[PDB]
Design a protein around this ligand. Structure first.
Ligand SMILES: Cc1nc2ccccc2[nH]1
Ligand SMILES: [Cl-]
Ligand SMILES: [Cl-]
Ligand SMILES: [Cl-]
Length: 163
């Protein structure tokens, strides 16, 4: 575990993280995809061997000794708000199980279902609050990766509000 487990946010490519493992915002079929998933595929392509897994689950595949946790958030274009919310909470609970099992002291995480799976809605608060529900009981240092400057400010404020 980390000496004083923390949350941080960085505005940069998660493929350049400084943590002991990475969470991929994966698709259920293990395909290269786009956004976070394509960056992860370019950096750790070996991790996409038998990475296919259902919505609401997470599957870990090694790239050398570096773990890639493929977490499959719902596509809100396809799910009801209610069913999508349940699957999004579930995907993060499965990430917390994998981070615990791996014994890592740190993890790089994106906000699941906030990009092309958002069904065109702003889901920053929804996705972040499900990330906290899952990860609060883990002792890894969590570093949240985003692209947008306004999202960085909002995520930082949400972290700071609990401190
Ligand atoms: C956190 C993160 N990493 C990315 C890589 C490519 C595109 C969007 C991304 N967002
Ligand atoms: Cl970057
Ligand atoms: Cl997404
Ligand atoms: Cl973002």
């Amino acid at each position: 575990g980390a000496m004083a487990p923390s949350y941080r946010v960085k505005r940069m490519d998660i493929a350049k993280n400084d943590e002991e493992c990475v969470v991929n915002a994966a698709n259920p079929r293990g395909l290269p995809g786009d956004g976070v998933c394509k960056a992860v595929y370019k950096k750790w392509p070996e991790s996409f061997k038998n990475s296919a897994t259902p919505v609401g689950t997470a599957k870990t595949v090694m790239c050398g000794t570096y773990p890639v946790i493929h977490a499959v958030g719902p596509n809100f274009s396809n799910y009801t708000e209610s069913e999508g919310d349940r699957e999004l909470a579930a995907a993060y609970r499965e990430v917390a199980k994998e981070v615990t099992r791996l014994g890592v002291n740190s993890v790089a995480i994106p906000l699941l279902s906030t990009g092309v799976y958002s069904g065109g809605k702003d889901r920053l608060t929804q996705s972040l609050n499900h990330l906290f529900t899952a990860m609060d009981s883990t002792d890894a240092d969590v570093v949240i990766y985003c692209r947008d400057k306004e999202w960085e400010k909002k995520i930082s404020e949400a972290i700071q509000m609990r401190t």
